[PDB]
Design an enzyme around this catalytic site. Sequence first.
Site, PDB file in Angstrom:
ATOM      1  N   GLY A 315       2.622  -2.036  15.202  1.00  0.00           N
ATOM      2  CA  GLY A 315       2.297  -3.450  14.886  1.00  0.00           C
ATOM      3  C   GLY A 315       1.926  -3.673  13.433  1.00  0.00           C
ATOM      4  O   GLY A 315       2.409  -4.583  12.787  1.00  0.00           O
ATOM      5  N   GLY A 321       6.032  -3.906   6.779  1.00  0.00           N
ATOM      6  CA  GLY A 321       7.474  -3.888   6.599  1.00  0.00           C
ATOM      7  C   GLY A 321       8.210  -5.202   6.563  1.00  0.00           C
ATOM      8  O   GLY A 321       9.088  -5.389   5.708  1.00  0.00           O
ATOM      9  N   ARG A 325      10.046  -7.094   3.264  1.00  0.00           N
ATOM     10  CA  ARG A 325      11.422  -7.659   3.270  1.00  0.00           C
ATOM     11  C   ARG A 325      11.402  -9.110   2.770  1.00  0.00           C
ATOM     12  O   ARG A 325      12.272  -9.514   2.002  1.00  0.00           O
ATOM     13  CB  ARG A 325      11.993  -7.638   4.673  1.00  0.00           C
ATOM     14  CG  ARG A 325      12.283  -6.217   5.155  1.00  0.00           C
ATOM     15  CD  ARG A 325      13.172  -6.241   6.383  1.00  0.00           C
ATOM     16  NE  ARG A 325      12.525  -6.758   7.551  1.00  0.00           N
ATOM     17  CZ  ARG A 325      11.730  -6.082   8.376  1.00  0.00           C
ATOM     18  NH1 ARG A 325      11.421  -4.798   8.158  1.00  0.00           N
ATOM     19  NH2 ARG A 325      11.220  -6.696   9.454  1.00  0.00           N
ATOM     20  N   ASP A 326      10.387  -9.888   3.153  1.00  0.00           N
ATOM     21  CA  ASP A 326      10.282 -11.284   2.649  1.00  0.00           C
ATOM     22  C   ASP A 326      10.241 -11.282   1.103  1.00  0.00           C
ATOM     23  O   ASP A 326      10.851 -12.092   0.452  1.00  0.00           O
ATOM     24  CB  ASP A 326       9.002 -11.978   3.178  1.00  0.00           C
ATOM     25  CG  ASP A 326       9.081 -12.367   4.627  1.00  0.00           C
ATOM     26  OD1 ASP A 326       7.994 -12.595   5.171  1.00  0.00           O
ATOM     27  OD2 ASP A 326      10.190 -12.420   5.171  1.00  0.00           O
ATOM     28  N   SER A 879     -21.163 -12.386  -0.906  1.00  0.00           N
ATOM     29  CA  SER A 879     -20.383 -12.688   0.240  1.00  0.00           C
ATOM     30  C   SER A 879     -21.088 -12.128   1.489  1.00  0.00           C
ATOM     31  O   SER A 879     -22.300 -12.340   1.637  1.00  0.00           O
ATOM     32  CB  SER A 879     -18.920 -12.215   0.038  1.00  0.00           C
ATOM     33  OG  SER A 879     -18.817 -10.849  -0.285  1.00  0.00           O
ATOM     34  N   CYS A1128       4.634  16.342  -6.973  1.00  0.00           N
ATOM     35  CA  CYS A1128       4.306  15.848  -5.578  1.00  0.00           C
ATOM     36  C   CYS A1128       5.445  16.166  -4.639  1.00  0.00           C
ATOM     37  O   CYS A1128       5.689  17.340  -4.330  1.00  0.00           O
ATOM     38  CB  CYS A1128       3.800  14.420  -5.625  1.00  0.00           C
ATOM     39  SG  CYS A1128       2.882  14.020  -4.104  1.00  0.00           S
ATOM     40  N   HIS A1253      -0.188  13.478  -9.703  1.00  0.00           N
ATOM     41  CA  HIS A1253       0.788  12.632 -10.412  1.00  0.00           C
ATOM     42  C   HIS A1253       0.349  12.302 -11.854  1.00  0.00           C
ATOM     43  O   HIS A1253      -0.230  11.272 -12.098  1.00  0.00           O
ATOM     44  CB  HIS A1253       0.900  11.323  -9.630  1.00  0.00           C
ATOM     45  CG  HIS A1253       1.772  11.394  -8.446  1.00  0.00           C
ATOM     46  ND1 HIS A1253       1.286  11.336  -7.136  1.00  0.00           N
ATOM     47  CD2 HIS A1253       3.109  11.380  -8.342  1.00  0.00           C
ATOM     48  CE1 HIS A1253       2.310  11.282  -6.296  1.00  0.00           C
ATOM     49  NE2 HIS A1253       3.412  11.265  -6.993  1.00  0.00           N
ATOM     50  N   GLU A1255       2.207  11.356 -14.218  1.00  0.00           N
ATOM     51  CA  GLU A1255       3.030  10.255 -14.645  1.00  0.00           C
ATOM     52  C   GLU A1255       2.480   8.939 -14.141  1.00  0.00           C
ATOM     53  O   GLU A1255       2.898   7.912 -14.645  1.00  0.00           O
ATOM     54  CB  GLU A1255       4.483  10.377 -14.190  1.00  0.00           C
ATOM     55  CG  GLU A1255       4.807  10.087 -12.717  1.00  0.00           C
ATOM     56  CD  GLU A1255       4.308  11.097 -11.677  1.00  0.00           C
ATOM     57  OE1 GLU A1255       3.502  12.037 -11.962  1.00  0.00           O
ATOM     58  OE2 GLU A1255       4.720  10.893 -10.518  1.00  0.00           O
TER      59      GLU A1255
HETATM   60  N1  LIG Z   1      -8.351  -3.612   5.285  1.00  0.00           N
HETATM   61  C1  LIG Z   1      -8.562  -3.112   4.040  1.00  0.00           C
HETATM   62  N2  LIG Z   1      -7.634  -2.334   3.434  1.00  0.00           N
HETATM   63  C2  LIG Z   1      -7.818  -1.888   2.149  1.00  0.00           C
HETATM   64  N3  LIG Z   1      -8.885  -2.173   1.362  1.00  0.00           N
HETATM   65  C3  LIG Z   1      -9.860  -2.911   1.933  1.00  0.00           C
HETATM   66  C4  LIG Z   1      -9.771  -3.406   3.302  1.00  0.00           C
HETATM   67  N4  LIG Z   1     -10.911  -4.088   3.555  1.00  0.00           N
HETATM   68  C5  LIG Z   1     -11.624  -4.023   2.462  1.00  0.00           C
HETATM   69  N5  LIG Z   1     -11.012  -3.321   1.498  1.00  0.00           N
HETATM   70  C6  LIG Z   1     -11.554  -3.089   0.143  1.00  0.00           C
HETATM   71  O1  LIG Z   1     -12.841  -2.537   0.244  1.00  0.00           O
HETATM   72  C7  LIG Z   1     -13.674  -3.146  -0.774  1.00  0.00           C
HETATM   73  C8  LIG Z   1     -14.843  -3.834  -0.096  1.00  0.00           C
HETATM   74  O2  LIG Z   1     -14.344  -4.889   0.763  1.00  0.00           O
HETATM   75  P1  LIG Z   1     -15.262  -6.118   1.131  1.00  0.00           P
HETATM   76  O3  LIG Z   1     -16.712  -5.726   1.137  1.00  0.00           O
HETATM   77  O4  LIG Z   1     -14.605  -6.792   2.305  1.00  0.00           O
HETATM   78  O5  LIG Z   1     -14.912  -7.025  -0.171  1.00  0.00           O
HETATM   79  P2  LIG Z   1     -15.680  -8.444  -0.549  1.00  0.00           P
HETATM   80  O6  LIG Z   1     -17.049  -8.476   0.148  1.00  0.00           O
HETATM   81  O7  LIG Z   1     -15.776  -8.326  -2.097  1.00  0.00           O
HETATM   82  O8  LIG Z   1     -14.783  -9.581  -0.164  1.00  0.00           O
HETATM   83  C9  LIG Z   1     -12.838  -4.100  -1.566  1.00  0.00           C
HETATM   84  O9  LIG Z   1     -12.317  -3.389  -2.743  1.00  0.00           O
HETATM   85  C10 LIG Z   1     -11.687  -4.410  -0.620  1.00  0.00           C
HETATM   86  O10 LIG Z   1     -10.480  -4.797  -1.337  1.00  0.00           O
HETATM   87 MG   LIG Z   2     -16.594  -9.549  -3.444  1.00  0.00          MG
HETATM   88 MG   LIG Z   3     -14.645 -10.878   1.368  1.00  0.00          MG
HETATM   89 MG   LIG Z   4     -18.259  -7.002   0.916  1.00  0.00          MG
END
Ligand SMILES: Nc1ncnc2c1ncn2[C@@H]1O[C@H](COP(=O)(O)OP(=O)(O)O)[C@@H](O)[C@H]1O
Ligand SMILES: [Mg+2]
Ligand SMILES: [Mg+2]
Ligand SMILES: [Mg+2]
EC number: 6.3.5.3
Length: 1288
Positions: A315, A321, A325-326, A879, A1128, A1253, A1255
């Site tokens: 899912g 994926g 493609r979009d 937040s 790699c 990596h 590079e």
């Molecule tokens: N599902 C996820 N996949 C990848 N990175 C994530 C995911 N959820 C959160 N992150 C990353 O983890 C960090 C903390 O996330 P979060 O506390 O939700 O951010 P914020 O409170 O600033 O909105 C951020 O760098 C966010 O981009």
């Molecule tokens: Mg934040």
């Molecule tokens: Mg947030």
């Molecule tokens: Mg947060």
Amino acid sequence: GLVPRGSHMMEILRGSPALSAFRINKLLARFQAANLQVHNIYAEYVHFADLNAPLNDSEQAQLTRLLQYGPALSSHTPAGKLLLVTPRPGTISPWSSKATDIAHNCGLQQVDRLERGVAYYIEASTLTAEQWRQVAAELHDRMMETVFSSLTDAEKLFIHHQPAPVSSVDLLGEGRQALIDANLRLGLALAEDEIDYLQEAFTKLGRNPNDIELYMFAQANSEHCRHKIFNADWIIDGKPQPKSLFKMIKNTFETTPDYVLSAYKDNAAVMEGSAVGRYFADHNTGRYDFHQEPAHILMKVETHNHPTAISPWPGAATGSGGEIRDEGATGRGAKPKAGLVGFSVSNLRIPGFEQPWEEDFGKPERIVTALDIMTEGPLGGAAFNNEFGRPALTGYFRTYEEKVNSHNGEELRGYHKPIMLAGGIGNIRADHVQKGEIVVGAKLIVLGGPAMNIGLGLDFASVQRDNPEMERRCQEVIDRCWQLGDANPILFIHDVGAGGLSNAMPELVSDGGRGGKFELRDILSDEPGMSPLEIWCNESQERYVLAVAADQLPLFDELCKRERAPYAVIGDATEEQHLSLHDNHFDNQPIDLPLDVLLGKTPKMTRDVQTLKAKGDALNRADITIADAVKRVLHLPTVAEKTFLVTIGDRTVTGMVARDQMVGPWQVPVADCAVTTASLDSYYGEAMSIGERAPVALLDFAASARLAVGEALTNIAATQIGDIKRIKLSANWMAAAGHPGEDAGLYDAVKAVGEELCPQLGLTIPVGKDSMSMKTRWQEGNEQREMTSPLSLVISAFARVEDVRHTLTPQLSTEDNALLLIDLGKGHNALGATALAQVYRQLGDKPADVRDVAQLKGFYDAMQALVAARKLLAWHDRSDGGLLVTLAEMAFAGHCGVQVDIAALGDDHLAALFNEELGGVIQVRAEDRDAVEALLAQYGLADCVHYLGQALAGDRFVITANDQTVFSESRTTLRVWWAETTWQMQRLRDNPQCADQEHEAKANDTDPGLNVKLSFDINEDIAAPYIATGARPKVAVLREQGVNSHVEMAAAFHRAGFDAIDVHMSDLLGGRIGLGNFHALVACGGFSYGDVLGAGEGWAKSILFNHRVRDEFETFFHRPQTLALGVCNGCQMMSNLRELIPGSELWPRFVRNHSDRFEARFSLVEVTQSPSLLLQGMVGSQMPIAVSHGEGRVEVRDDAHLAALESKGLVALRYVDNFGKVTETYPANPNGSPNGITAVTTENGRVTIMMPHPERVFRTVANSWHPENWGEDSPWMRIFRNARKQLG
Ligand SMILES: Nc1ncnc2c1ncn2[C@@H]1O[C@H](COP(=O)(O)OP(=O)(O)O)[C@@H](O)[C@H]1O
Ligand SMILES: [Mg+2]
Ligand SMILES: [Mg+2]
Ligand SMILES: [Mg+2]
């Protein structure tokens, strides 16, 4: 093992042990917990080869060799009861697709198909037949696998079935009842008025509809595909409304068209980017060159909510994926460049780590748990992004499941049907933004994978399937097309998604004002049993549709063959607006319809609804103390450290990643937004951020939407953008439409952002999507139960960036400083629908909101002025978890203390600390405090701005109010509590010894963080005297299908003065390139063949098994002055090619990481003394490097081999911990390699292979953390300059 199998023969080949000891112990512990007395279990891979003709001895030995891979775990003699787990009959694993491809590319055309199972040998002599069934249940996924009692039962996987014919529905012979019956039998979900429409259409045509025609119609008219709700008329509280939801979104574009190149007329929006050097290999020369031109910016965000509730890995994978493609199908072809990821689920209830707010409310049998979604889903999303090759750089993850008094009274609100969100940005050329015209006679092509019976109709039809390497192959063709500029042969391209070809092909001709005529038998199929309906309507993945002029077919064919991307011409565009699908096998016409009939609409929807509004209840603080609240809030997954979601996903492929989630020397995942550079030669770039606040919608629909916009802005604000009109939004709306209160709430929230907030700020919403059945119903005991999501708007913000170097993060400095709070809540300090309320099982009274639109804009503009003037040391927005969490996260990132006074923030300390109002904390130099305060005052913010205090060296997190200590704790203690969620998730998903090591290191405050010692001048361009001559040696930048890291490899060599030449393995095989014309060769990174049959093995064995190409490589490596580098995937490849490489007899193999997980890390290495000519001058240096691999663990035959390699002195890099010691402790050593080994060279030093990596990080700007005084060049640039100088 080899037996008749219809007109073919099936061979059985035993593979290697399949499970490591921790996985075996976990199974035994699960059996023990379920009361199954299992004394032992052992698992082996078994391979099945369906052959169309025999193998001679030499071919048989090749096949056996191809099927030797993986870690060298100890074999056991089979013992006990055999349970063989395989894919379900009628399905073909992605493993099979890729393994078969390898066999074919190794000359084994006799192999019709390879498939793999796991043979489990269970010793449990005392078990009943009942209990054996429970054992079998533990060992397989019921949604995609079955269990067999004999190896020979795998014959069932390869049964050939004859094509099923089309079926007519007998309207003329039965009347309307035929349509009613077909509606139920085919699961068409047709409305009464749709049945009327079909009844009349076919009555007019005077013939019976075929099943395929009805299915096609039904797909195209679903809510998922038609957006009826977003185009509906509304009446709310008895008053007709003037605009649809869609028209209200479009209002933002009417108001703010600025910088927008494309909105609402493609499956991505496009905005202006920057003029930069777009770097790619010319069609005629094969040389990589910079092309100075605008790189405009596309954006798209999608969801995959329902399939993820059923089967989360695929899912999430196909969520990524489809969205990719979009992007690639934007305009006349475009290039994805970075991704984003979102999850919302119910409570995790992690065994042994249950939190005090969590209650088990049950769930439907047929869906998975929130825990299984967060275990398998992110792996799936990551599997796609990793194997396709786009970095995943920002995301969100929210848990919510509670019984609350919301708009419809007391009810269960949550995410049993999850949010699974995948999005991203890409770049596109200006002349390709607009779809072209489709000339009459254009050839109509399907690019990508052979179809199977996927997505039609335990919910098997919702079980998806992903093959990301197939999609990479397609992307390369799309790249070659847009890279031809004015000669791009793509006239029109579109992704294949819902409805399969039955939606996509009609849409593509119709979008060009054309019809089409199609031939069913020209479509590539891996399932010969399929009906015309199944062929035309299946939702098989990794497909695109496009139109090309007939005269460009020879070019298109050349492009596809060179990338090994399958394609088929399946029809022709017609002047007549008719759709015809012919079947050459049955000599008949499954589809024969005017397009207006097919695409004709029933009337618009009218939604007549009423407002419900919840009365808040004040937060009952009886059991709340500040100290307890801190501990709880840090344990809310929404708040808590996100590492398990971050390091599983590549963050460095392309070499353009400037700011990823991990921040500072301690690599703490708190970055508020993502930033990429626009090109490999610019500091212009792109940014992405997310805002979301669904629980607020349980109290106030419009406030939840305003906060999602606000938080996207606060997350992005400390990146150098300028004009707020440069920021463009995706708005993804998730709701349970029809649930009492939700419809009016949806309308009000769309209106709140589209009609009001976004126009007032100057924010466009040029793209978006909606998912409108976000609820789950089941029978739980004797009673009906329902779990309904809050209205859930996710906003993604996207912007062109003026200078990526000027981005701030949450990493506090301890130079003399001031911490200032910008409280856009204006002291309202709302606690309703906060993390605080949630963790005490409450909703509270009144939530946060956008308090003052002008002040929000003034905040954004003030931040932009401070960023450009370089006046900020750090920023972190507020937040989830409030000011408390913002300050704690800053202290974690800076590995320091804070001394903070909150007396100015109100007498209610709990509210001051835990409200989730907009705003955040800036850190500035002490000497700049007055000037910064004056600047903020200029933007109308004085009353919102509060001096808090200062960051201090050490481990104290102190919050005072006058002479009273409000809260005081060890920062380390807080930081470890905040880590416990990702600890526990890693612990249950990955090798628990690695999860524990990672976690425990966080508790050692003496960790000095990543740090650098340099043995050379990183600014000294030792290649400059060579470059100055204008003499540029070639480098063969070698790629196989599925390689993804070749462009930045080329660029690194280019900067050192090479002419980088694109050499595909197809070029070597076709004679177009010969290695005798090169003095230097580099094998690049990625996922060649999706690493099936062992990373790098298919690539190497394809070389070894073709005598001509094998000889070519051998000749190359035996020349006296040639240089080669393997990085790699290339390192893995070259390690498998040892027999051709002199001086390589002691090289190790590279196998599955000890963590059993992909590791995307910024790791510390030391350069060690070895013959390697590419590391000359660098010995004793210690600096971080990008690591992105699942199979990087050095594996030796025995200790004699490890000792011999070491004594020969061929180790060239080793992982070190931050104390600088060679280590095997994780993740400092990310893969478990003995003695930290991660690079080796040959005796003569002319060939070096390494897993990390260089590079990806040759530009300073692309290093997640680096010393502030570095220039444009990182230390790793020296590898490429050493190569240049060595050639002379
Ligand atoms: N599902 C996820 N996949 C990848 N990175 C994530 C995911 N959820 C959160 N992150 C990353 O983890 C960090 C903390 O996330 P979060 O506390 O939700 O951010 P914020 O409170 O600033 O909105 C951020 O760098 C966010 O981009
Ligand atoms: Mg934040
Ligand atoms: Mg947030
Ligand atoms: Mg947060």
